[PDB]
Symmetry: C3
Subunit: 360 residues, 3 copies
């Protein structure tokens, strides 16, 4: 049992699915292991839809950080005081962004504008009430009942100022209802939206690339890691951030050194990652990742404010060289390892690359 | 059973009670049910006093947010470096405030200076040490010993520089101690205290009124609610604040919608409310309140900074009308409900009311 | 069980490492002792000791540390990945250098005991990031422990270092050349350059005792130091909001804490006889008194300290009871509170001319 590896064949839970797309939530982290109890308050939600579709109005009881891991998207957030907000999200093109935070209980709807590409979304959610994520759909479809349908009849009459039959016909009539929450929209309607919506760094080399961005407000960090077959992300550790990794495409070998099960005895937690798999990396635990195929991930780092990336090989951000460069440093290295301070520095300098190495 | 309902008849517990007043504490929220886990840190204290009384000095291990739900009170804070803070609180006259935060561990005493009216107080507590709330009384009365009496004879003689017998005669002697912590005081005493003390937005209509106040630093809000008999507070929800309702006087019928037991299936949680009953309205969960008689509530909303009030019926703060005014609002609403967008838009317009409605 | 706030050194510390040169101990979890101590689930104490002229090999831990020197001197160096370093000289008593420093989570660091005759005693508060356990990753390869480097695959180490595993093993891990442990002995001459640059980079008390506190506003934690003459008393008092953790550095003391019987209006006295390395917890707003039974010195940490206030129940300074007496109605109020009359109690409160610390022989 590698308690930090979440296989896709078990970890995700289908919430919705139809010919046009699907929604799944990842299982509680702390339920998998108590060693992951500081991740109790965080949950993952994944979404996928075919071209030209619309996700109907809803509001969830969690703070969402929506990331587009493929395609484009039109997001419109609706405010109770007659105000609206539009955002055009695209995973690549440097003109538009690929993430947007959505405040708890804010009604929003999503559109996949492209006629060819699918919208692939991954999001960090942070529930308000208790650790479970609750989505309140306003729609009445074949798949689900609208929440207004839960209140009592005269409460509905007295509110809307109409007779139930009128209110029902216009709102709830089984006839006329759409099938599910992911609906197929028409090309004409969305050109108008897209237009208005549209009006509104990296470290890598031959073998890989790494792009991170930190949201000081949420105290969260968002990465993008691309690696080509045979590449290697040399051993390293993130000082303060807890890192949640997700395979978007590809497969890779992961090696994590954690505590053996409060001692000075280690143990390795090796795993073989593939599409939709999620791997957790605790703050300060060393890790190395090698591309078994071309692979790209998206990661969320929690506790991101003032985090340092410490590398254990290569020319850039190497802490061992740094130790060797302290005032009486070489003497420290010679006592740390079996060689001499000179010998270790010699070895530490053989490698000419930084971050992403070739491992074959 | 409804996990959000706290029946006064069996949810409060008496700390102290005597011919002049009482103090009871509400049971733990997370104990009634795990759904209520993000409330494990808060508590509700209730206290009522007869006219012209004093609550003897004490300090508690919790932050208090005190609220006059009926009557008037003279609150005084005693700081160690020869300082006091005098506050005059009342429920109705717009000249004085109706609430006051009391920092943890601060010595304070209370007075009901009125010669005819009783004092009714409701307060939100945030214990510092663990889930329990601890009150340390300085007083020595027939109902309780002073905490000073838990110290050893030699610690006491040394501290005060007096033989244990002097100390006993002045501070603890049985003959002279009041009967309990609530005390009957004379009108002439509270005369000069009143002077000294006194020198130191609403939405509604004929059917009911709502008055809300947000304490930015505490990130908590207080709501006062009065609805005439037969009035309805139409279906609404709050984006992020989890709400705790308390009935001060009167009767009401409530319906809250939420998750049936992580899915899309809902459930209705209804309840018939009366005095001192408590009801938890989770953030983002739709709710409606129908007044069975003339009723007055007091509410505490926690995790309130930036919370929004989403209404589902009427002229003010209606989300549904706002979705209609979006770019292709009508088309979205069209796909959201059975009716066309023009139809549901016209429907939403029949109710001229806002917030409170006639439902006699 | 009996007294949930007392932690006997004998059965409360677990040894992480120990050898001829020094040792590292970790205190048992606060919550694991008593459910009453719930709000300290995420806090820990680590204790360390060193012989004169010793070095503690590099390591990074997954906890934010607040290091405090309880005796001796130390040179602390923090190593950053961007070719940057931070040097600190720490001492316990001479008012010229600091006695404490905070080490952020995941920062590589190493400590030296420059002194040729004195030991180095450190007490430290830890706030773990991952879960309640505190983990320490040692970079070193010694008879005692292997380096976390040794835990990756040979081929990954080869690709990483661009070296054949035989040379990688030679130069780094060969046991035919490693030290016996993580606390190692050094030469005064070796640290010649270091020490130089290191060295180049609130009290209320009387004849009976001295209190010295400081508050790291960023961390919302308070640091106290108490010294008391044998036979002295820190009269009854309480902290309004801070939860205080007390550690006996040297000496013996008698403590009396007044808490609840288990929400009643019934109190109960929790008492103990403290001595070297015992930890005693003092909850926010719970009354307490300490009688020094031998010359004694304490170091304590105060969590949830921003805005805290000290309330004494006896003495001429910070006396809350006299402060009630001087209120617009005070005397009337004090007369109903206690058995005697307001003038009578007010008379008694003034017999004690001392403040904070009092003679109790
Ligand atoms: C990332 O990797 C590719 C392939 O090695 C390289 O051409 C590219 O310049 C790198 N950086 C960016 C920003 O694409
Ligand atoms: C406020 O609410 C009460 C209760 O329904 C109502 O009777 C009263 O007319 C309202 N009036 C004003 C001025 O707010
Ligand atoms: C502090 O307390 C000590 C120890 O009890 C006392 O002897 C000393 O003189 C006090 N004052 C100063 C300045 O140290």
């Amino acid at each position: 049992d590698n308690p930090f590896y979440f296989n896709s064949d078990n970890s995700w839970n289908t919430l919705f699915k139809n010919q046009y797309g699907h929604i799944r939530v990842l299982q509680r982290f702390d339920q998998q292991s108590k060693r992951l109890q500081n991740l109790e308050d965080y949950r993952l939600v994944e979404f996928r839809s075919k071209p030209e579709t619309l996700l109907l109005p809803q509001q969830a009881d969690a703070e969402l950080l929506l990331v587009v891991r493929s395609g484009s998207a039109i997001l419109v957030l609706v405010k109770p005081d007659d105000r609206r907000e539009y955002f055009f999200l695209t995973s690549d093109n440097p003109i538009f962004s690929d993430h947007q935070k959505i405040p708890a209980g804010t009604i929003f709807y999503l559109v996949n504008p492209d006629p060819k590409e699918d919208l692939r979304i991954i999001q960090l959610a942070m529930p308000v009430n208790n650790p479970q994520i609750h989505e309140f759909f306003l729609s009445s479809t074949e798949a689900q009942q609208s929440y207004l349908q839960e209140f009592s009849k005269h409460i509905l009459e007295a509110s809307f100022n109409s007779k139930f039959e009128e209110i029902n016909r216009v709102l709830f009539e089984e006839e006329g209802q759409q099938e599910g929450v992911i609906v197929n929209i028409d090309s004409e309607q969305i050109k108008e939206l897209s237009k208005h919506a549209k009006s509104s760094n990296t470290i890598g080399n031959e073998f890989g690339n790494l792009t991170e961005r930190t949201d000081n407000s949420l105290n969260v960090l968002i990465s993008s890691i691309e690696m080509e077959e045979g590449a290697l992300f040399v051993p390293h550790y993130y000082s303060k951030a807890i890192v949640i990794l997700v395979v978007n495409e590809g497969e890779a070998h992961v090696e994590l050194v954690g505590p053996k099960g409060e001692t000075l005895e280690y143990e390795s937690y090796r795993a073989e990652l593939s599409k939709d798999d999620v791997f957790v990396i605790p703050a300060a635990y060393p890790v190395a990742i090698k591309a078994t195929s071309n692979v790209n991930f998206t990661g969320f780092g929690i506790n991101a404010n003032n985090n340092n990336r410490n590398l254990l090989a290569g020319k850039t951000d190497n802490v061992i060289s740094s130790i060797g460069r302290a005032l009486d440093g070489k003497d420290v290295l010679g006592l740390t390892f079996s060689g001499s301070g000179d010998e270790v520095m010699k070895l530490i300098n053989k490698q000419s690359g930084s971050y992403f190495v070739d491992a074959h």
